Amino acid sequence: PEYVRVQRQKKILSIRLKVPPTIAQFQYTLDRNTAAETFKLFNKYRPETAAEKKERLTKEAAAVAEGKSKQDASPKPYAVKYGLNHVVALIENKKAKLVLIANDVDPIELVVFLPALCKKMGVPYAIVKGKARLGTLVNQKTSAVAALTEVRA
Amino acid sequence: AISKNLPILKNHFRKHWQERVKVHFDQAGKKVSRRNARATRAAKIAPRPLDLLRPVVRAPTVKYNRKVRAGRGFTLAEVKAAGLTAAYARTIGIAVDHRRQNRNQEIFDANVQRLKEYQSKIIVFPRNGKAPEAEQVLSAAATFPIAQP
Amino acid sequence: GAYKYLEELQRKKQSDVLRFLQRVRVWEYRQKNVIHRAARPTRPDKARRLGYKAKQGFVIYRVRVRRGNRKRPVPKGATYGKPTNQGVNELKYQRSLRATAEERVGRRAANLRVLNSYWVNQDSTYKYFEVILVDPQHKAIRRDARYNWICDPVHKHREARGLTATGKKSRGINKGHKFNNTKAGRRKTWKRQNTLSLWRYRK
Amino acid sequence: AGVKAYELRTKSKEQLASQLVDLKKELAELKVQKLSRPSLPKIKTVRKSIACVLTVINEQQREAVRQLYKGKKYQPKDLRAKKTRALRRALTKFEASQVTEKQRKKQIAFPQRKYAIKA
Amino acid sequence: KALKVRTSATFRLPKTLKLARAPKYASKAVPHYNRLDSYKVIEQPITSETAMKKVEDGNILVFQVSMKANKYQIKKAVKELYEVDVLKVNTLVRPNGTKKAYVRLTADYDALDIANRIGYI
Amino acid sequence: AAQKSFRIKQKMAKAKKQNRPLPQWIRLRTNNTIRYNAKRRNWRRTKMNI
RNA sequence: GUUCUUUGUAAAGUGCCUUCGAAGAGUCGAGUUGUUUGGGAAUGCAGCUCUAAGUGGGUGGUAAAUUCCAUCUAAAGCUAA
RNA sequence: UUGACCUCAAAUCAGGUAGGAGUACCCGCUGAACUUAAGCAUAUCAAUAAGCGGAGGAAAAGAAACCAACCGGGAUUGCCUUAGUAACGGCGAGUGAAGCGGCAAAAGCUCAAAUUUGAAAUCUGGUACCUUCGGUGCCCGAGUUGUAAUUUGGAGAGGG
């Protein structure tokens, strides 16, 4: 069908042409072995889902106004930061310590400046394969960006 | 065509002007409507003065710069000088113009004094609903007229 | 905010990175239909400053139109009139090509309302545009009072009446002496100054 | 004579159906006597009686289905208030009175005050 | 792993599961009664002097019937309104815009003896 | 003709029924101005054009 | 006019000091062509080509260069009489 | 092998919506010639008639990338006036506004551009119940390629 042919030749047309150096710094993505430990460390800092957020509020609705607490009954969170608008700001404010960038973003212009912004700001970055796998650790379908601000000792 | 000495006339009637003739037969009819509209409005806007207070303004264009004229709004710097905020002033009947400035001290002090006399002549009613009614005066311009300096 | 970085990047249209994407995307859009559904906007920063929001009810369509002048039909070139009206090959179609793209989309998706449009790509034969459409019957637009104005029936086919951004530009509706002919409506202004006003007591 | 609408609404579904058959039987005999007599005004009473039964029968079934669709969304379209094509497409009172959360604070904090100019 | 083995060079739309309609409301919620019942099929007998002689001679009943009725409904309504047996039904459209039906009974019934029960003679 | 569609014959039946004189009791009604059938048609005098 | 519910350690307004202050691109603009206008070295519009800037840009009814001033903040949208 | 993601389809899928009529007035496109110039080609008739698309009870316009050169005006529209004026035009025939001034009527506004990041706080749908132009609970989904709140230049925000 036409949709099958248009998606195969799109990959074909994008490799016969001379790709400018801003692009093609992708597909040099992290290797299969190294990416295993990267997603092993990132999986320990999953953000709270819609499931476990609800009983967090129940314990915070019985301790703050009842136990005379200052809303500090829950510990300080340790979660992976996601979202293009949020992470880009974290890069500019010297807050990120490791940034993961997907290589298969269809509107590629969203993330072309991310390797250049990370380099000049000095924050380490890693172009990782798969925007779908990035969404899994943030409990979304696609995230395409994954950053870590703080880490347990 | 041209004879019998006469001034050369320029009558622009070479198009289909008869299709666009507007005779104002409703001049008496629409005047009654405006008075009826003004009467039915004032009952809906109970006893507010049917119009906002407007400042004194000097005209440009030296043919007209010798005259003072009612303006649009009270020039945000003037509102603060009178002792009230712009958002509050719009609810008391003080029209506000944010896009004009003050470069004339005589006009500025005349408008500030205009706002001081307005707050000393109003009865602001509380939101509660006590309603000590203050039977309507139909014009805010006939109470504070524009006077030539 | 990443939208500042895309906004500055989209202005470098002749840079190597943008002109390679321009050549790739002009091929892909040409293989598809003339009017087809776009899953996501090509330029997210350009769409969201034109009124687009990323929720249910906002639809993006991609449309291409043929470039060039407008040839007067006049079979075999004959006009049957004065020589001042004999031109056939240099008429310019006072409505913009972006307005024609909006009008073609508004007839296919007649259940939607055209919000705005923007230029995405072009070639010698085709100019490509992406049109932002909203659903007036979706409850997310019927509620959310920032956007429920489109549901009131005076906004039916805004692009067909020149009420869009490109429609008012083609109608010349601006302020100042340069738009004296067209600032309240060309036909209304002309009718105003071509009307013989007569009163009961003649002045 | 003729049947009365209020006398028919006190009967069951089967009684009205059985009465409709008898009126249809009665109408058939009058259409046989009509072709042999110069005038038969009696046939109008029988025909309008059939219309009365069919109106009450249709009203009872419409009322019965209106109760099993009561208090729930997606009622059948002929049991819905038509009232106009355009007014059906218009925004409801809840939707038309919707205001954004930002302008809600402005109306609360700065209502249109009530005042007069005498003193 | 490998891919599927295709013995044909033509790709065709796959057969997807079709879902039966499960509406949340009825289309009309009140079913219309029988448009053409036995009392609407047969309106009135035709009693012209030429039609009357066909009754006692040819054992044929002549009726004026609805224009929407076919020979099946005319046969079914005749045997239900008068409880007789029908041999054949012949129908024509009269020049005045009404349908005329020639209903012939079997040899076990007499058309003259039941036209008397109907009324007219 | 003699092998005609049903639509043609339906208009034939209507034209045959309207080809009648006025009922005599209509002329006796109160405030009546109708004297004769002014829409009378004859096959020899004017054609009905289907 | 009466009456039932307290929204809320909520929201909003104003003073002083300090650091900032993000503001719309094949768009503005220019050339050319056609059309249009009272707009005249080109009023608006459109096709094609070129293609911006950030103490910037548009306008200031004669084309150009140079030096100032005045005035607004485009290329997004809503709204009674 | 299995489970996602992306894109593209299918169904008499669940619920909706578009057509046509009318068209005096309104918003656009398209677009003549008769006529006038005592001929006629620019021009004029006319940015009109006919043709086409799209609305409402009004529509459109509308809160300045404006007018101004002033002792400065201050969204839009309409009327009086400016004015048959400036100007346009085989500078022939003819065409032809706008600022100010008086009056009618008056109303102002918000998105994009920000990190909520100590918690997507946002929303459709389905279902159950209820005080049913909706509300509450629960469950899928939309959405981080950004939905809410805050902010719109008249400012405003982070802070103290």
Tab-separated table of C-alpha atoms (C1' of nucleotides) in Angstrom, chain G residues 30-31 41-42 62-66:
chain	number	residue	atom	x	y	z
G	30	A	C1'	12.617	45.089	-1.273
G	31	G	C1'	12.398	44.194	-6.723
G	41	A	C1'	8.805	58.004	-8.567
G	42	A	C1'	3.725	53.469	-7.147
G	62	U	C1'	7.881	63.455	-3.482
G	63	A	C1'	12.172	59.439	-5.103
G	64	A	C1'	17.622	58.995	-2.641
G	65	A	C1'	21.798	59.352	0.932
G	66	U	C1'	23.108	61.232	5.818
